[PDB]
Amino acid sequence: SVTPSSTGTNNGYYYSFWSDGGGDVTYTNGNGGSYSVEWTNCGNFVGGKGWNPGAAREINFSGSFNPSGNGYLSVYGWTTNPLVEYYIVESYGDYNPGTAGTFLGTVDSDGSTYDIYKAVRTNAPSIEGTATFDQYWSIRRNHRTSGTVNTGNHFNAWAQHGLQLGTHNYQIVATEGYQSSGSSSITVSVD
Ligand code: NA
């Protein structure tokens, strides 16, 4: 059983929780900017708290992230026109999600080098429904579960590689799992 997919406002933050119904997933909004997820042999889910619309901002995040298998903790968001799904992956489990993309280079931000990848998702779920769209990745080499992400540094580095962003839609500190188990308990803020 899974928490039903849902979106909106909670304690002044935006949140989104989405799953494909697979396995067992329990998403729980907490006070302020906090949320938790526990999951067992999920399908695919993505959930967390943040803002709508996103921006070039410094996002503070802290908490726990305990993937057993493939899961990510990322600044995660969308733009439109063009439609782009982007990830600034601060921690992952046993799978580096850049495997699926093309390596374009690196960016240094907030105390670590990141590896940058572009992937193409063909007829995949999106905030505009089933669609084909680019995916931008910045994957932190020095995994962590607390600190500050300067999203503008990533937007900058992606643009240096010819990767254009559209108009910002939502932007959250997302826990994501794919065919894995685990848990997270995360708090978000911006100064
Ligand atoms: Na669009």
Residue numbers in the entry: 29 to 219
Article excerpt on this structure:
We successfully crystallized and solved the structure of BmXyn11A extending to 1.55-Å resolution, by molecular replacement using an AlphaFold2-predicted structure of BmXyn11A as the search model. Comparisons with previously solved GH11 members from bacteria and fungi show high conservation, even among kingdoms, with Cα-root mean square deviation (RMSD) values of <0.6 Å to BmXyn11A, which could suggest either retention of this enzyme in B. mokoenaii after the split between yeast and filamentous fungi or possibly a recent horizontal gene transfer event. BmXyn11A had the highest specific activity of the recombinant enzymes on xylan (4,350 U · mg−1), nearly 4-fold higher on beechwood GX than on the closely related GH11 XynB from Aspergillus niger An76 (1,146 U · mg−1). BmXyn11A reached near-maximum xylan hydrolysis levels after only 15 min, releasing mainly smaller XOs (xylose, X1; xylobiose, X2; and xylotriose, X3). The differences in XO distributions between BmXyn11A and SlXyn10A from GX correspond to previous studies, where GH11 xylanases require three unsubstituted xylose units for attack on the xylan backbone, while GH10 xylanases can accommodate more branched xylans. B. mokoenaii is the standout species thanks to its secreted powerful BmXyn11A, which likely facilitates the rapid growth on xylan.
The savanna soil yeast Blastobotrys mokoenaii displays superior growth on xylan thanks to an efficient secreted glycoside hydrolase family 11 (GH11) xylanase; solving its crystal structure revealed a high similarity to xylanases from filamentous fungi. Xylan degradation requires an arsenal of CAZymes such as carbohydrate esterases (CEs) and glycoside hydrolases (GHs), with the most common xylan backbone-cleaving endo-β-1,4-xylanases being found in glycoside hydrolase family 10 (GH10), GH11, and GH30 (7, 8). Endo-β-1,4-xylanases are the main enzymes responsible for xylan depolymerization, supported by β-xylosidases.
